[PDB]
Symmetry: C2
Subunit: 279 residues, 2 copies
């Protein structure tokens, strides 16, 4: 079990530096659009201020701005060349629990890639430094890249958030509720354990989904919704979901010893789809 990101090449070819007056950060060049975070101008008063000569766009790794809009927390620039390296793409929101890949960029230059999970408090625990705004998070299905996160800000140490390409910011933060354990990913990780001969924590005892979801409201766990991915894990291991929901209720109380895939606490950052693909 490894934190595994999509290869970053397709996205790499779309990362541009967008600049406006003093501030500069990362932009996403798709077709004739350049997406970027709007605080590049620091709002409706600020938009009237600018002209197309207020934005310069550079590709590092020759563009003129001939259009300007704002859409939510995002600037929708238009440019005179369609990116010849534009992947087949989509805009979509990620619901909490789900994982996506991040291309961390600075001054329009990609420098790192890693995977994060969209936390239940609508933040993400990645590694972002000053000027990484405009880095893009994405997943990939078949051949269609699917862009789901533009980076914008850092709330406290290590907690970051950002927007979907519809301009909406995750968790409505303007340019934090308590975190919870993603119950369905914990379930996946527990199945991953069983599939690697580490099954000391399984009992015949069971907790119904409804009982667990009530218990979850009281202990900062997410509502469990079963999926085909989880069901396939159930079949292969022989161990029912509800057994795992019981073991969670007990393991949270403490590991009393005793390890699971090298960890002393619960892991909620690997998804069912993650586990299936890797095991």
């Amino acid at each position: 079990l490894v934190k595994m990101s999509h290869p970053s090449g397709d996205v790499e070819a779309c990362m541009v530096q967008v600049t406006c007056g003093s501030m500069t950060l990362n932009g996403l060049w798709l077709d004739n659009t350049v997406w970027c975070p709007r605080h590049v101008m620091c709002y409706d008063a600020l938009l009237i201020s600018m002209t197309n000569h207020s934005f310069s766009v550079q590709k590092h790794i020759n563009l003129r701005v001939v259009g300007h809009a704002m859409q939510g927390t995002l600037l929708k620039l238009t440019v005179d060349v369609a990116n010849p390296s534009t992947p087949a793409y989509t805009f979509t929101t990620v619901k909490p629990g789900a994982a996506f890949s991040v291309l961390a960029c600075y001054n329009g230059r990609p420098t790192g890639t890693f995977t994060v999970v969209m936390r239940p408090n609508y933040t993400i625990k990645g590694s972002f430094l000053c000027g990484s705004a405009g880095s893009v998070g994405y997943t990939k299905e078949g051949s269609v890249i699917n862009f789901c996160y533009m980076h914008q800000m850092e709330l406290a140490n290590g907690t970051h958030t950002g927007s979907a390409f519809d301009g909406t910011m995750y968790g409505a933060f303007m340019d934090q509720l308590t975190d919870k354990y993603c119950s369905v990913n914990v379930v996946a990780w527990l199945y991953a354990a069983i599939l690697n001969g580490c099954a000391w924590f399984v009992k015949p005892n069971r907790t119904s989904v409804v009982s667990f979801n009530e218990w979850a409201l009281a202990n900062q766990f997410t509502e469990f919704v079963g999926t085909q991915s989880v069901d396939m894990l159930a079949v292969k291991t022989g161990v029912a979901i509800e057994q795992l929901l019981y073991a969670i209720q007990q393991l949270y109380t403490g590991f009393q010893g005793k390890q699971i895939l090298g960890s002393t606490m619960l892991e909620d950052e690997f998804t069912p789809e993650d586990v299936n693909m890797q095991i």
Copy 2:
């Protein structure tokens, strides 16, 4: 967080290499395609023999990503556990590159491929027993590991086999830890826990740094019998030691008492030690 280099560069150089009924990945730089030598093996073999049996067209090289399609093999040599295949088209997308061998504790990025197609990228550290903890399935041999200083790619790994651990070749042909294409006990990476501690100090968890200090030379001989690696300090560590004020010898003592166990305490809310982040990592991310 575990953080791999962008892969677009390397993605441009991945090909599929076919020989008989066997297919895996190769790396395409200049006129040379490197691939693991067991692509020659039908379902203990004698590689020098099979390499003789190789005819002008026993090798086929497809490139799937970017602009297709097929490359003609023009000559074939063996080197170590790899094949050096020469092709008449030079890779236009070849970058500046070197062939470095990583040492244990060092971290490199892997690009996992299947039939020439990149499918995922992650980061491993090379284990003290010369294995890596990857995610690799059938047909992933040929997947390459690399680091990038400047815009220079340091290719350091070609994936060969599964032992649940993994190993492969340096690009000079030599398998890591001298495994054969037909496991000693792991140890804790002393310098990487030093680096991990330093990230704890830098983050507000500083309780373990008693003013007592164990020297390098003595921690080392201690390590030889408690499954730690010989500590070798580096300028990267020293930056992490000036920024905190805590001396290396302090944490070397702290490892000696923390190995016994955490006595009901948390560092980074970890009960065991983490040896999978490097001083370079800490320096970059904190």
